[PDB]
Amino acid sequence: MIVFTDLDGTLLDERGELGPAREALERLRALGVPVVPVTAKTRKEVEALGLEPPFIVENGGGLYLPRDWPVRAGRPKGGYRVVSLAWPYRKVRARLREAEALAGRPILGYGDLTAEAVARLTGLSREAARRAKAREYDETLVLCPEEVEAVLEALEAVGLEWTHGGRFYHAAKGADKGRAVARLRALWPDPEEARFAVGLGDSLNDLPLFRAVDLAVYVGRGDPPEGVLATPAPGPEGFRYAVERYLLPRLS
Amino acid sequence: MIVFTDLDGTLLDERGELGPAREALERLRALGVPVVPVTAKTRKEVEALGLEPPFIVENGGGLYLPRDWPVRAGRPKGGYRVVSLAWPYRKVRARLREAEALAGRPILGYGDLTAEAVARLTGLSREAARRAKAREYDETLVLCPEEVEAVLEALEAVGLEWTHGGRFYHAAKGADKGRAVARLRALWPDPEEARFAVGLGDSLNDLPLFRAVDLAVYVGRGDPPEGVLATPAPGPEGFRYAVERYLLPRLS
Ligand SMILES: O=C(O)[C@@H](CO)O[C@H]1O[C@H](CO)[C@@H](O)[C@H](O)[C@@H]1O
Ligand SMILES: O=[P-]([O-])[O-]
Ligand SMILES: [Cl-]
Ligand SMILES: [Mg+2]
Ligand SMILES: [Mg+2]
């Protein structure tokens, strides 16, 4: 069993801290069940949470492996090996300029904004904002609600893909959580261990995650996606519940 | 006679240069007629055009005088004395943060954007965009169309004033072209020379300029405001025509 999990809204509280998920995580760790973050966050953000590879960043754009991963894949990015699945950020940003020209209205993303501006928009500290701006694949968009329809069509027109991470729309090409999870599973050292996969999440960017796993659990607010399991409480308390009620009974 | 002149679309042509207006200006110079730029541009932008003081920047937010101006006014700053008529950019930005809280939605402006983003949104080079970002009084806003009215009400609630500059909305407090013109006229060394003021502009947003002068000339497209003279051709062509038709005969 491998547990693939979103970070924001799932494993982290609304303050963005691993506090409440501790018990649940240590439980999984004590039972030697691998937990793999699969997130919209950048590598710098994931590192700042103290999380170690393997992990999947920027909506599946990059798969980070430990340098000594037993299965050789990706290129050394120092201390890590990285499997790049999506276009690099610079190319997404260039293509966004074309979408903007098509749309005839500004399309702003983190790359257009100061760290101070991003901090003010996200509630993050200045330092956290810098790490959120350090993007390698995916762009976080800051869209007018009323312009979303026109903008998304312009993204599609110019060959970009879009998703939503819980609060913001994102633009990328080739970044898919499910594709990244499937790749990581295929690169897993122990085939038996990767044979059964669990996925937890709460946002639109997680539907591809739910489809790439064998057991999907939704810990967001409102109704679960089609035929996906639910929990009585959202976020980390939902994560804890799922571990205790869905996973442990499966590990016996 | 003093000639107060708008820059963009008035003294400057489509390529941001001179042309027909160069000869017109040289002619005014020769007759000893002061020409005073009055512009939405920042002092850094005005300097990049090679323009010497006195001039009025940021829609009347600041009046720049030569350091050795015969009438003592303003605060010394290098080769200038500066009469600040409006709140400083820093205070405007802080009030904008308050307006954001009232409007319950982000209010972004140039201070939140990189020079590259400002360049892209305005069609300027990165270098010119850096100069447009060096703002001392007025903030340029990038507002969602459907959120404008909510934003503008919020701006006013926190004590800001707003204008629409053709492309973007602006926020400031105390920045008015007419007040700046009246101030400069009151600070003119030779009162007789300041008794008759001409104001040339190309926009309806030049109304405050037009009201503060004795002879108003519109060199913009379409109909001029009521009580404002018009020229057959727009831009520098109009500037040249206006100088030939309205001003030159007066000095003879
Ligand atoms: O899309 C979102 O709702 C969140 C979900 O994690 O991701 C963005 O927003 C987060 C901050 O709220 C950043 O940490 C991520 O890097 C990304 O920019
Ligand atoms: O970590 P993000 O996809 O909420
Ligand atoms: Cl101007
Ligand atoms: Mg999420
Ligand atoms: Mg103008």
- In this complex, the residue of B97, B113, B120 whose CB is nearest that of residue A97 is B120
Contact B113 A117 (CB under 8 A): yes
A42's tokens: 């950048």
Residue B70 distance to chain A (closest CA, Å): 43
**In the block, residue with structure tokens 């006195």:** B54
How open is the CA angle B148-B150-B151, to the nearest 5 degrees? 60
- As a whole number of angstroms, the distance between CA B210 and CA B4 comes to 10
Is residue A113 within 8 Å of residue A142, measured between CB atoms? yes
Which resolution, in Å, applies to this structure?
1.9
Cβ contacts of B219 within 8 Å, gap of 6 or more: B9, B10, B200, B201, B202, B230, B231, B233, B234, B235, B237, B238, B239, B242
- As a whole number of angstroms, the distance between CA A220 and CA A9 comes to 7
Q: Can the peptide bond before residue A54 be classed as cis, meaning omega within 30 degrees of 0?
A: yes
**Where is the binding site for Mg(2+), in residues of A?**
6, 8, 165, 202-203, 206
- As a whole number of angstroms, the distance between CA B51 and CA B21 comes to 14
- In this complex, the residue of A106, A146, A147 whose CB is nearest that of residue B142 is A106
Is residue B231 within 8 Å of residue B238, measured between CB atoms? yes
- As a whole number of angstroms, the distance between CA A30 and CA A109 comes to 41
Residue B168 distance to chain A (closest CA, Å): 11
- In single-letter form, the type of residue at position B47 comes to E
Contact A114 B116 (CB under 8 A): no
- As a whole number of angstroms, the distance between CA B150 and CA A46 comes to 37
Is residue A179 within 8 Å of residue A60, measured between CB atoms? yes
A40's tokens: 């919209």
The answer to whether residue A98 neighbours chain B at the CB level (below 8 Å) is no
Chain B residues in contact with A147 (beta carbon < 8 A): 144-146
What method was applied to determine this entry?
Answer: X-ray
Is residue A23 within 8 Å of residue A13, measured between CB atoms? no
- As a whole number of angstroms, the distance between CA B68 and CA B226 comes to 39
A218's tokens: 């939704």
Nearest residue to A65 (alpha-carbon basis) of A172, A177, A189, A215: A189
A128's tokens: 């956290």
Cβ contacts of B206 within 8 Å, gap of 6 or more: B6, B177, B199, B218, B220
Nearest residue to B137 (alpha-carbon basis) of B202, B205, B40, B210: B40
The answer to whether residue B73 neighbours chain A at the CB level (below 8 Å) is no
Beta pairing, strands B80-84 & B62-66: antiparallel
Cα distances from B83 to residues A14, A88, A237, B163, B242, in angstroms, run 48, 49, 60, 21, 30
**In the block, residue with structure tokens 């140039």:** B110
- In single-letter form, the type of residue at position B192 comes to E
B12's tokens: 């400057």
Residue B121 distance to chain A (closest CA, Å): 7
- In single-letter form, the type of residue at position A246 comes to Y
B204-229 in b/e form (b: 16+ CB < 10 A) is bbbbbbbbbbebbbbbbeeebbeebb
Chain A residues in contact with B106 (beta carbon < 8 A): 120-121, 142
How far does CA B22 lie from the centroid of its chain?
20
Domains and CATH numbers, chain A: 1-86+174-252 (3.40.50.1000), 87-173 (3.30.980.20)
Nearest residue to B177 (alpha-carbon basis) of B5, B3, B2, B16: B5
B128-151 in b/e form (b: 16+ CB < 10 A) is bbbbbbebbbbbbbbbbeebeebb
A147's tokens: 């312009």
Nearest residue to A218 (alpha-carbon basis) of A237, A234, A196, A240: A234
B157's tokens: 């609630």
Burial class (CB in 10 A: 0-12, 13-18, 19+), B73: middle
Looking at chain B, the residues that come just before a C–N gap of over 2.5 A are: none
Cβ contacts of A177 within 8 Å, gap of 6 or more: A38, A56, A59, A60, A201, A205, A206, A208, A209, A212
The answer to whether residue A112 neighbours chain B at the CB level (below 8 Å) is yes
Is residue B201 within 8 Å of residue B6, measured between CB atoms? yes
Residues at CB less than 6 angstroms from ligand 2:
A 6-9, 39-41, 165-166, 203, 205
How open is the CA angle B26-B29-B34, to the nearest 5 degrees? 130
Q: How many CB atoms lie within 10 A of CB B231?
A: 21
The answer to whether residue A108 neighbours chain B at the CB level (below 8 Å) is yes
Cβ contacts of A179 within 8 Å, gap of 6 or more: A60, A85, A208, A212
Give CB contacts under 8 A, 24+ apart, made by A217-225.
A217/A242, A217/A246, A219/A9, A219/A10, A220/A9, A220/A10, A220/A166
Q: Which residue of A has its CA nearest to B147?
A: A144
Cβ contacts of A247 within 8 Å, gap of 6 or more: A1, A3, A28, A33, A198
Q: How many CB atoms lie within 10 A of CB A222?
A: 8
Say how many CA atoms lie within 13 Å of B85 toward its Cβ. 21
Look up B6 and say whether it is catalytic: yes
Nearest CA owner, ligand 2 atom 4: A8
Contact B147 A144 (CB under 8 A): yes
Is residue B168 within 8 Å of residue B142, measured between CB atoms? yes
- As a whole number of angstroms, the distance between CA B16 and CA B8 comes to 7
- As a whole number of angstroms, the distance between CA B186 and CA B195 comes to 10
Cα distances from A120 to residues A67, A133, B149, B227, in angstroms, run 36, 13, 22, 46
- As a whole number of angstroms, the distance between CA B246 and CA B248 comes to 6
Cα distances from A238 to residues A11, A24, A30, B20, in angstroms, run 9, 10, 20, 72
Q: What is the 3-state secondary structure (H, E, C) of chain B?
A: CEEEECCECCCECCCCCCCHHHHHHHHHHHCCCCEEEECCCCHHHHHHCCCCCCEEEHHHCEEEEECCCCCCCCEEECCEEEEECCCCHHHHHHHHHHHHHHHCCCCCEHHHECHHHHHHHHCCCHHHHHHHHCCCCCEEECCCHHHHHHHHHHHHHCCCEEEECCCCEEEECCCCHHHHHHHHHHCCCCHHHHCCEEEEECCHHHHHHHHHCCEEEECCCCCCCCCCEECCCCHHHHHHHHHHHHHHHHHC
Sheet with A62-66: strands ordered across: A55-57, A62-66, A80-84, A75-76
- As a whole number of angstroms, the distance between CA B234 and CA B13 comes to 9
Q: What are phi and psi of B184, to 5 degrees?
A: -60, -40
Q: What is the 3-state secondary structure (H, E, C) of chain A?
A: CEEEECHHHHHCCCCCCCCCCHHHHHHHHHCCCCEEEECCCCHHHHHHCCCCCCEEEHHHCEEEEECCCCCCCCEECCCEEEEECCCCHHHHHHHHHHHHHHHCCCCEEHHHECHHHHHHHHCCCHHHHHHHHCCCCCEEEECCHHHHHHHHHHHHHCCCEEEECCCCEEEECCCCHHHHHHHHHHCCCCHHHHCCEEEEECCHHHHHHHHHCCEEEECCCCCCCCCCEECCCCHHHHHHHHHHHHHHHHCC
B227's tokens: 């009580």
- In single-letter form, the type of residue at position B165 comes to G
